[model samples]
Target: LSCLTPDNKPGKCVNIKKCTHLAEIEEDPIGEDETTYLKNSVCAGPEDNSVCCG
Candidate 1:
């Protein structure tokens, strides 16, 4: 997941911009957004670095 920027926009992880220290929630599960978001989440990454929230 990404972090909130100073303008309250989505920024990269804890690297580039200053984060608001809150995770941006997933988009509404309408249409194909849910599938797309899930596939791009950390949960879908390598098992060694993955974190399952729920």
Candidate 2:
């Protein structure tokens, strides 16, 4: 989300420091990371699927 540098140019992600150190890793009850991600994906792989694979 931080897209600007001091020079006013488009900046690369120099760091992704988490804002909340107290926050624990989120747990998804569905299943493994891939499965949960796929389930939470914008669209399923079948009809009406909008989430494209990287």
Candidate 3:
């Protein structure tokens, strides 16, 4: 599955474990605005795991 990124770019909804962009942001520090944007970019299978929409 897929969705638009926070910046309005085309994005893929993949497992967060596999979504390199999101993971990198997680390990590296950014800010809540970026965090909120990505967090809002959502894909769902179950609540147990999150999908990357950015």
Maximum-lDDT candidate = 3
Residue-wise lDDT of candidate 1 within 1-54, one digit each (tens)? 554443455645432122232134322234476445433433334333433332
The clash tally of candidate 2 reads: 0
Ranking by TM-score: 3, 1, 2
RMSD of 1: 9.4
Q: Write the per-residue lDDT of candidate 2 for residues 1-54, one digit (tens) a residue.
A: 333333455533221133221112234234476555444332333334233222
The residue pairs that clash in candidate 3, if any, are none
lDDT of each: 0.38, 0.33, 0.68
Instruction: Estimate the TM-score of every prediction.
Output: 0.24, 0.22, 0.55
Best by TM-score: 3
* Global Cα RMSD, each model: 9.4, 12.5, 3.3
Report how far off residue 25 is in candidate 2 (Å): 22
